[PDB]
Design a protein around this ligand. Structure first.
Ligand SMILES: Nc1ncnc2c1ncn2[C@@H]1O[C@H](COP(=O)(O)OP(=O)(O)OP(=O)(O)O)[C@@H](O)[C@H]1O
Ligand SMILES: Nc1ncnc2c1ncn2[C@@H]1O[C@H](COP(=O)(O)OP(=O)(O)OP(=O)(O)O)[C@@H](O)[C@H]1O
Ligand SMILES: [Mg+2]
Ligand SMILES: [Mg+2]
Ligand SMILES: [Zn+2]
Lengths: 639, 565, 254
DNA sequence: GTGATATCTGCTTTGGGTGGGTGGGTGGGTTGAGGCAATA
DNA sequence: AAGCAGATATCAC
């Protein structure tokens, strides 16, 4: 009572700060941008009133009610009409919560009625449904209107109000609902699961249930990595006047954050200068910098850079489509770093979905039906390739996938669409992704005296659907062995600067993020003797963060093909296709088709993107032709 | 607000609103319809909110905020105005009127319906943007119809009669469920009977339930399309079918639970859209007069290069040949084509084009669907991609369609036959499909791409231009748009040309010539008696483009021999 | 009842129809003679003939079949017993030669009206017994009573007449009187189907001698009354859904 | 004053996963992935 | 919310 009034007074004092002005300005912006939720940083509250912050974090529901009442009063003070516009104003929290930073494993009963910040992966989402807040009813006979308020266990002030609408007045005269005058709010439920890398040994990850209401709905979709700030509550229930004493617990969100680069003017200037510095060296340097811990497979790295940059998809006025996504296949001998390159792309690309041939199915790749959590409605859940829409799917052990499962990949690889015709569902799903696949030859170890087609053991149509195919061979050469051995041993000797000698990597880890914003760019990575060697360092390495920003900026450019590039590409395609037995030893790894011409155009466009050029010039076309020439032919040894 | 003033204002708008008609230039748009409703030549009245906006935008805003209220207000205004607009007696009185002639709720005598035609200022939404802030408001939503229900009767007013006192009782209904009355409430029965529902004295309305879906191109990245439920009543029924693209104006409302299920369920509710308006979404002679066959064929997928004769064959599959014998007996006209070739020769692009052009069609893949598309493609085209990837069960279905033009199903011994009168356009990669299936195709085209410098140079020049400009390189004759190509195809299909007696000997001479070559070739050609019937089928299709003449037989012959190479 | 049907006038009109109508000896007089010769007490009447002779009688037959057909039965019985002084009295079966409706166009305005539709039989049920007269026996004195069914409801006795005990009358199910009923599923004909739509299906109910008169696979024209029946929310409650289900009470098979 | 007979009160229902898999699938719930035997 | 089982006070004869 008196404590609630004092808390409301304190919160009103906190938001009226013109006498530094951060929250007075924030509320003005809230009004201007047509919002009804203000995000408050608990660090400022802690600075100005420590006791009020501790109470807010430890007695969450009452303190949040007082905070929201104070916010409504303040907004009304700035502008009364706007305050009348909205039923309620909400408060979200951010900053550092100390020990309240938890995961779904560490979120225990001791955090009940507290504000917590949870970090995890979204596994399940639900449909948005309306929830009645205030009901308005009219009496035609008596010409008067009556209002009703509803609340449940999920509201800030929990009370189990009745769901039945009024139907008649105290007088027998009947009542009719004014739906356009009533108030409803959106409601959704999600599940957040522990990050698998953080789980203890042998343990499947734990999960927690979260409730999103109002604006927070649809802020997260399955597959996202999120940070949710909310309040922890138990939902007690009874049946037949009996309670089991065991209660479900939910997190009632007040803020949802994602874990889209943010660009400062200095970074933009750095990117522009980097693009301007060299004409031909940008692409080569970027490709050299891709996966530093792997000794060079230089052409493969250039191809992977092209895949990350991509081409430009064409939409024609008639409605026909030409894809811009570049697909790559790597077939190789054991232990040539195929899986490591796939893992690097998984770690670096903005949207990358891992998959194994033996551990995946067509259903799991495309989409699955099941009963809706509510009403038991036949609903669809996205598979790997739909989750990878406008992203990358990395398929390891591609040769192990079943033929029937493999066939489901053709339509996505070529057209970019998934057709679902099952369980009384007819849908066309967008799966516009780039496929990066790794495989072994039929005999495990490539037989140089057999032909590429006999070693690869795949149908010509599937091979045709791949923009580039790379045969990676392990040839015992003493000089190459020396270089690779030096690189590998240097990698294994490395010790990160923070760690001490003798330290062992733990299996699992506690929560390390202690704030919503990370308390912690340079173009070139700082030289390390072990990571780079004692060589004179003539070749410089671009840093990971700068590479991530630069590739993001370049992916948005759409280079336009020019007449000279088109002429060169056409002539080179004619030469590639006409040439039969161009070298008598030489054999074609994949057939040359009009898809090869489209691949040339795609690679040239990606190269032009790397330079941040608005036009595709002859140098880009030459690079694409060089890549295709390297990839499409292999010498066959004669015994 | 006091609703009496609003009712008076609605009456005013209905009465004195006049709009410049095409000819009259001053007509009362809604007074005439009120006259028609009074005389019962019309059932449904559609109020366009643009007209209301012209006079007073505030009332349009009020209607859009609280639409279900203003629907009742407009209905009451119309019901009160109807007597004043009546001129003569109603010509014909049906069962309800006879019952009436032989207190009543105001809705028992109502025989019209009132709907709103949403304002042009309210731009349409996708099903996602219809959220909790729209509950009880008038919104316009776009989508694809995926399911429709048979029209059924829904009770609006239930009428009872007491067996003892013979009085009449009425029970207006405004819920998905209701509580029937049992015991008579009349004074006579109360001072000292059972109520029984009288179907003849009750008022029903046509009812229909349908599901809508989001357009694929509008779904956000990495999401699944959402769906909404639309409830349709009265004169808005039988408008939407599965597959059509519709724009639905209606009211977004929650579904009312009933019984103990009110108590158990919390504050959450399911929703639906209450439908108010459903909207489905001599130069010409000169184009038909000269070289029109070459022009139309060249217009098939202009972004593809070099498949001139295949494109000509696909045009015949679109017109489809004559369906009747000279005496009116039904015969099979549908033409089946299979494109066999090596990868990357635009087979899938050509099939994708034909699906978009065909008015009724279904595109399927060898493994994208199994164990239905044929039924939806009845009287249409079924594009079967990856034709050699299907299972035996799928193969048997296709075989029976090319034979009987029907699909037979057996639900645990309960047989049923569905119409499958569709054309089959198949694409396959050479390995091994059974010969029993290949001989059924009228045209078997083997697309082989042998490398050649000049042709490869020309193809590359075409493709690079398309990537450079997002359209085909210019040619002497401009391709025709799909909107315009579907008109000529439909117009041609109306004709039913016949083959004369005279050509009998000539067509026979061609058949033996084809047979002799097949025996001499010693290849696996499928020239049989079935080939003779194929000459007639193609010949009549060619005429339907242009009574069959010798020039159509020559083109049909040439197209076929070019196919067998 | 909201019907402009005078029973006596309808009966007189139909007797006049049987007496005077001539097919272009009255036709149905010959039919009655053939009925006597054969012994099957069913008279089929073509609605087109009734329309030609009398347009009011036809209009009333179509609008109120339930009320009007029994008067036709009374008329035919009276006339037949005059001309020829049979297990049961003769029953009229009006029919339309051609279908007057499509299964896809059935509307609420057609409820409780005589209609004809064409279709193909797909399923028939096993026989369903319907109680017509209930049989009660006192569990104390063995006194027996019979109660006539009334609109699907039975008035269970509360006290035995002979011994006045209360709540002692038990219904003896197998001493009651039952009649036959059959459920049939009719599928829309392939010809009338719009292009690319799945066939519609309708439920028909046949009674007494019309049961087992069609088999799955048959193509039939069915003349009957269109009915609308309420659907209970669940078996325990008396709540009903606002949307009614429909079927056809079969009167004539062709 | 006894025999109905009319009014009032408390129980539990629903299909549902906080009501179990130590109730049972002959009491009743689509979709997919995973072992078998027979299969080719 | 809807309906059956049980309890019980109440009119009527
Ligand atoms: N060129 C290389 N540079 C650096 N490390 C390498 C190189 N080749 C192999 N390695 C290391 O050797 C091991 C090779 O295993 P990896 O899974 O990458 O091989 P792979 O080519 O995918 O084999 P497989 O076909 O058997 O799955 C990894 O530790 C990888 O780091
Ligand atoms: N003649 C051509 N003109 C224009 N584009 C062509 C031509 N041939 C092939 N292409 C292009 O090649 C790409 C592959 O074509 P498509 O997928 O239709 O081949 P396909 O014959 O169906 O192959 P598959 O047998 O492998 O399924 C498409 O972009 C198509 O536009
Ligand atoms: Mg590997
Ligand atoms: Mg294809
Ligand atoms: Zn007795």
């Amino acid at each position: 009572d008196v404590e609630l009034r004092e808390a409301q007074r304190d919160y009103l004092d906190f938001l009226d700060d013109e006498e530094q002005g951060i929250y007075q300005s924030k509320v003005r912006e809230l009004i201007s941008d047509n919002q009804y939720r203000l995000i408050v940083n608990v660090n400022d509250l802690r600075r100005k009133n420590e006791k009020r912050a501790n109470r807010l974090l430890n007695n969450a529901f009452e303190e949040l009610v007082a905070f929201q009442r104070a916010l409504k009063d303040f907004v009304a003070s700035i502008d009364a009409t706007y305050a009348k516009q909205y039923e309620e104003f909400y408060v979200g929290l951010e900053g550092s919560f100390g020990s309240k930073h938890v995961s779904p494993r560490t979120l225990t009963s001791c955090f009940l009625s507290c504000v917590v910040c949870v970090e995890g992966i979204v596994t399940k989402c639900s449909l948005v449904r309306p929830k009645v807040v205030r009901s308005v009813h009219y009496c035609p006979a008596t010409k008067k209107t009556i209002e009703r308020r509803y609340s449940d266990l999920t509201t800030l002030v929990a009370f189990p109000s009745s769901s039945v609408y009024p139907t008649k007045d105290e007088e027998n005269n009947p009542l009719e609902t004014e739906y356009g005058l009533s108030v409803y709010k959106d409601h959704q439920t999600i599940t957040i699961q522990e990050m698998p890398e953080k789980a203890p040994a042998g343990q499947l990850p734990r999960s927690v249930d979260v409730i999103l209401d109002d604006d927070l709905v649809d802020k997260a979709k399955p597959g996202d990595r999120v940070q949710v700030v909310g309040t922890y509550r138990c939902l007690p229930g009874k049946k037949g006047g009996y309670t089991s004493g065991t209660f479900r617990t939910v997190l009632i969100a007040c803020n949802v954050k994602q874990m889209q680069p943010s660009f400062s003017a200095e970074d933009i200037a750095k990117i522009k200068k980097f693009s301007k510095t060299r004409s031909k060296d940008i692409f080569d340097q970027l490709a050299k910098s891709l996966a530093p811990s792997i000794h060079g497979h230089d052409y493969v790295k250039k191809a992977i850079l092209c895949l990350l940059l991509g081409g430009v998809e064409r939409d024609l006025e008639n409605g026909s489509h030409i894809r811009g996504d570049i697909n790559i296949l790597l077939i190789g001998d054991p232990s040539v770093a195929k899986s490591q390159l796939l893992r690097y792309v998984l770690c670096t690309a903005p949207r990358a979905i891992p998959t194994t041939g033996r551990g995946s199915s067509g259903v799991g790749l495309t989409a699955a039906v099941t009963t809706d959590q509510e009403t038991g409605e036949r609903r669809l859940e996205a598979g790997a390739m739909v989750l990878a829409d406008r992203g990358v799917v990395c398929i390891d052990e591609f040769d192990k996938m079943s033929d029937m499962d493999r066939t489901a990949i053709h339509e996505v690889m070529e057209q970019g669409r998934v057709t679902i015709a099952k369980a009384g569902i007819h849908a066309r799903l967008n799966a516009r992704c780039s496929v990066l696949a790794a495989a072994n030859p039929v005999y495990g170890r490539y037989d140089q005296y057999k032909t590429p087609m006999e070693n690869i053991g795949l149908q010509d149509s599937l091979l045709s659907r791949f923009d580039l195919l790379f045969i990676m061979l392990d040839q015992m050469d003493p000089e190459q062995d020396r270089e690779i051995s030096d690189h590998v041993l240097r990698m294994h000797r490395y010790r990160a600067p923070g760690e001490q000698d003798g330290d062992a990597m733990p299996l699992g880890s506690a929560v390390d993020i202690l704030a919503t914003d990370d308390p912690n760019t340079q173009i070139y990575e700082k030289h390390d003797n072990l990571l780079h060697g004692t060589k004179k360092k003539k070749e410089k390495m671009v840093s990971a963060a700068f590479m991530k920003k630069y590739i993001h900026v370049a992916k948005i450019i759409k280079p336009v093909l020019t007449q000279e590039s088109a002429t060169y590409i056409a002539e080179e395609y004619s030469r590639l296709r006409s040439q039969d037995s161009m070298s008598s030893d030489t054999a074609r790894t994949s057939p040359v088709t009009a898809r090869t011409l489209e691949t040339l155009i795609r690679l040239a466009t990606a190269h032009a993107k790397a330079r941040m050029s608005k036009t595709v010039d002859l140098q880009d076309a030459e690079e694409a032709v060089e890549l295709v020439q390297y990839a499409y032919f292999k010498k066959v040894l004669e015994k | 607000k006091d609703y009496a003033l609003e009712k008076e204002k609605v009456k005013k708008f209905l009465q004195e609103f006049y709009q410049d008609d095409e000819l009259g230039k001053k007509q009362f748009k809604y007074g005439n319809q009120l006259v028609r409703l009074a005389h019962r030549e019309q059932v449904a009245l559609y109020v366009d909110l643009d007209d209301v906006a012209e006079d007073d935008p505030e009332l349009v805003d009020s209607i859009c905020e609280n639409a279900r209220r203003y629907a009742k207000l407009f209905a009451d205004a119309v019901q009160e105005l109807l007597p004043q607009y009546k001129e003569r007696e109603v010509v014909n009185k049906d069962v309800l009127d006879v019952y009436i002639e032989h207190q009543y709720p105001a809705e028992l005598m109502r025989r019209f319906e009132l709907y709103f035609q949403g304002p042009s200022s309210n731009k349409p939404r996708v099903i996602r943007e219809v959220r909790a802030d729209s509950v009880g408001k008038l919104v316009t939503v776009r989508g694809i119809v995926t399911r429709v229900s048979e029209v059924k009767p829904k009770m609006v007013v239930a009428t009872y009669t007491c067996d003892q006192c013979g009085a009449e009782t009425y029970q207006p209904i405004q819920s998905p469920t209701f509580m029937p009355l049992i015991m008579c409430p009349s004074q006579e029965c109360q001072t000292n009977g059972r109520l029984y529902l009288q179907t003849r004295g009750s008022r029903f309305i046509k009812f229909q339930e349908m599901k809508m879906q989001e357009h694929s191109d509008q779904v956000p990245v990495g999401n699944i399309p959402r769906s909404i439920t639309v409830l349709v009543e009265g004169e808005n029924t039988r408008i939407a079918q599965p597959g059509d693209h519709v724009s639905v104006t209606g009211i977004f409302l929650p579904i009312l639970r009933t019984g103990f299920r009110q108590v158990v369920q919390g504050l959450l509710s399911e929703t639906y859209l209450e439908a108010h308006r459903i909207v489905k979404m001599e130069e010409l002679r000169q184009i038909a007069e000269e070289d029109f066959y070459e022009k139309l064929a060249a217009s098939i997928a202009p972004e593809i290069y070099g498949h001139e004769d295949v494109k000509k064959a696909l045009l015949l599959l679109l017109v489809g040949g004559v369906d009747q014998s000279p005496r009116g007996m039904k015969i099979r006209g549908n033409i089946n084509i299979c494109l066999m070739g090596d990868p990357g020769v635009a087979k899938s692009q050509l099939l994708s084009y034909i699906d978009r052009l065909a008015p009724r069609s279904q595109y399927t893949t060898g493994r994208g669907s199994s164990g239905g598309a044929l039924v939806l493609a009845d009287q249409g085209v079924c594009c079967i991609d990856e034709f050699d990837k299907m299972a035996e069960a799928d193969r048997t279905a296709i075989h029976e369609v090319m034979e009987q033009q029907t699909i037979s199903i057996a639900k645990a011994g309960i047989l049923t036959t569905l119409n499958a009168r569709c054309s089959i356009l198949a694409a396959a990669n050479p390995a091994q499909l059974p010969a029993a299936l290949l001989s059924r195709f009228d045209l078997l085209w083997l697309i082989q791409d042998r490398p050649d410098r000049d042709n490869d140079l020309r193809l590359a020049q075409h493709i690079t231009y398309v990537h450079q400009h997002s359209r085909q390189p210019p040619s002497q004759f401009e391709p025709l748009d799909m909107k315009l190509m579907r008109r000529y195809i439909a117009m041609c299909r109306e004709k039913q040309p016949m083959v004369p007696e005279s050509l009998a000997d000539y067509i026979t001479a061609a058949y033996v010539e084809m047979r002799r070559e097949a025996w001499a070739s010693k290849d696996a050609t499928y020239t049989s008696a079935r080939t003779l019937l194929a000459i007639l089928r193609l010949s009549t299709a060619l005429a339907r483009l242009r009574v069959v003449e010798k020039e159509d037989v020559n083109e049909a012959i040439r197209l076929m021999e070019m196919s067998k190479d | 009842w909201g019907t402009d049907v005078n029973v006596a006038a309808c009966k007189e009109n139909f007797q006049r129809f049987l007496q005077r109508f001539i097919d272009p000896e009255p036709l149905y007089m010959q039919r009655l003679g053939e009925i006597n010769v054969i012994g099957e007490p069913f008279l089929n009447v073509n609605c087109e003939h009734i329309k030609s002779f009398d347009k009011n009688l036809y209009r009333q037959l179509i609008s109120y079949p339930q009320e009007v057909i029994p008067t036709f039965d009374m008329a035919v019985n009276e006339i037949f017993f005059d001309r020829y002084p049979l297990e049961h009295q003769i029953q009229v079966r009006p029919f339309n030669a051609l279908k007057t409706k499509n299964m896809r166009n059935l509307n609420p305005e057609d409820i409780d009206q005589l209609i004809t539709i064409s279709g193909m039989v797909i399923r028939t049920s096993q026989l369903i017994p319907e109680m017509q007269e209930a049989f009660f026996q006192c569990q104390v004195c063995a006194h027996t009573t019979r109660v006539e069914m009334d609109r699907g409801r039975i008035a269970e006795p509360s006290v035995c007449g002979r011994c006045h005990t209360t709540h002692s009358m038990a219904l003896i199910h197998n001493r009651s009187l039952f009649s036959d009923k059959q459920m049939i599923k009719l599928q829309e004909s392939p010809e009338d189907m719009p292009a690319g739509q799945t066939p519609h299906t309708v439920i028909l109910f046949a009674h007494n001698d019309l049961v087992d008169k069609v088999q799955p696979g048959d193509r039939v024209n069915v003349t009957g009354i269109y009915r609308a029946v309420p659907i209970r929310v669940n078996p325990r409650v008396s709540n009903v859904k606002s949307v009614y289900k429909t079927h056809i009470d079969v009167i004539h098979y062709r």
